């Protein structure tokens, strides 16, 4: 499913992401925009053989099992396919584990390069939240 900006902001707020570990909702909407263009079915293969899945492009080396990433961990304990659902619960739950992990949102290369230090509140402007 391809989300609208405000529809995603409301779903993320509902699943407890607004100010999770100190990151305002705008940060998570911005990351989702530049990771997946709001498309839950986005996948992208990396040079190392890992794949990134879903709205937040969570990576198979560490976080989910896709059966094709040799010697990967599955720290979120989910098949990577569960990250591609129109329901974002699995992505949200796994994102909360990633961002607690020590590097915060810098784990998302698009957030670091495109969102970090920007007026991220613009991402939720106009939305009924
Ligand atoms: Cl942090």
Curated annotation (Swiss-Prot):
Its EC number is 3.2.1.17. Residues 1-129 form the C-type lysozyme domain. Its main location: secreted. It holds the Pfam family Lys. Belongs to the glycosyl hydrolase 22 family. One of its GO terms (molecular function) is beta-N-acetylglucosaminidase activity. This is Lysozyme C. InterPro entries: Glyco_hydro_22, Glyco_hydro_22_CS, Glyco_hydro_22_lys, Lysozyme-like_dom_sf.
């Amino acid at each position: 499913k391809v989300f609208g900006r405000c529809e995603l902001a409301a779903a993320m707020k509902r699943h407890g992401l607004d100010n999770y570990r100190g990151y305002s909702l705008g940060n998570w909407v911005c990351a989702a925009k530049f990771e997946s263009n709001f498309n839950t079915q986005a996948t992208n293969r990396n040079t190392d053989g890992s794949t990134d899945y879903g709205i937040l492009q969570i990576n198979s080396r560490w976080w989910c099992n896709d059966g094709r990433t040799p010697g990967s961990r599955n720290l979120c304990n989910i098949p990577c396919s569960a990250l591609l659902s129109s329901d974002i619960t699995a992505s949200v739950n796994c994102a909360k584990k990633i961002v607690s992990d020590g590097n915060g949102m810098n784990a998302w290369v698009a957030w670091r390069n495109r969102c970090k230090g920007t007026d991220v509140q613009a991402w939720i402007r106009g939305c009924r939240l």
